[PDB]
């Protein structure tokens, strides 16, 4: 899984540690070991969630397989979790989508993973 | 609905109620209420729209259903329009990429839409 | 074809000239006018690939249609070698993801590609 936040939290309310915590959740999550998993964590944005430019988050996380009903609800519990005790991100103020990749759409290392 | 705006407009140059307004002008036009609506605009970016550095806009709008042919019509000249009026970006140097997402693959609040 | 790469490395390790190479190279490459090619470079990202801070690269090709097996291959050969030439990023951490878009969903010039 590759995971990507967009938030409107400061830079510096992002805790030393955060990407390695998303990295190890995320891999226990997936079931996937830590060094196929790539986070991508983006403060300071001008957003607004409601009209309202209270802490907010968008959200991507793209995986080849492994998504669905359950999982992906799953993964919303878990990620909303750690945004709401790490960023002080309220979990009504989050969004996440979730992309279901086909192997040969996914570029890696010159190639694909076809 | 949630927009996402890149560009290479400067910041100062965004208007101070923009991100009121396209929230605003996306309830509207999906009749969403505001509440659910979420707005994202990210200037200053280095970018290039055929081959040129003048001012563009790479975007994307993501929305549970609502996504189709004459609706995405119809947002692509609201969104052109409010881009050209308040970031004088001209509509031919804009895409918007349009997804119509399934309720089961966008998180909020811990679980998804589902 | 629109282009996108976020990546960890600095800004001033982006050399002069690499969003026209990279419009020019994707105009190669899919034969598109570059008049209609987008690209766009995002540098200073705060990330990690497979737990590593190392220079990587997460990034995106949209286009409507020549989205397939061996051309994708082929994209991430050329977008790769670019990345590892110019940003000095190894291939092995770069996911490129490719997005086949109808163009019913992509809007341009206050209408859609439809
Ligand atoms: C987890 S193993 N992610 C690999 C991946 C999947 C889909 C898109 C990009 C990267
Ligand atoms: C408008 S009600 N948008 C809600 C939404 C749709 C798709 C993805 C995230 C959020
Ligand atoms: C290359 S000609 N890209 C045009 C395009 C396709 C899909 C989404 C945005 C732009």
């Given at each position: 899984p590759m995971f990507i936040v967009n938030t409107n939290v400061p830079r510096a309310s992002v805790?030393?540690?955060f990407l390695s915590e998303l990295t190890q959740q995320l891999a226990?999550?997936?079931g996937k070991p830590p060094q196929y998993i790539a986070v991508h964590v983006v403060p300071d944005?001008?957003?607004a969630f409601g009209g309202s430019s209270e802490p907010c988050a968008l959200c991507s996380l793209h995986s080849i397989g492994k998504?669905?009903?359950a999982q992906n609800r799953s993964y919303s519990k878990l990620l909303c979790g750690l945004l709401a005790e790490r960023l002080r991100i309220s979990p009504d103020r989050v969004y996440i989508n979730y992309?279901?990749?086909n192997a040969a759409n996914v570029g890696w290392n010159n190639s694909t993973f076809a």
């Open positions: 805790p030393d540690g226990q999550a997936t944005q001008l957003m998504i669905g009903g992309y279901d990749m």
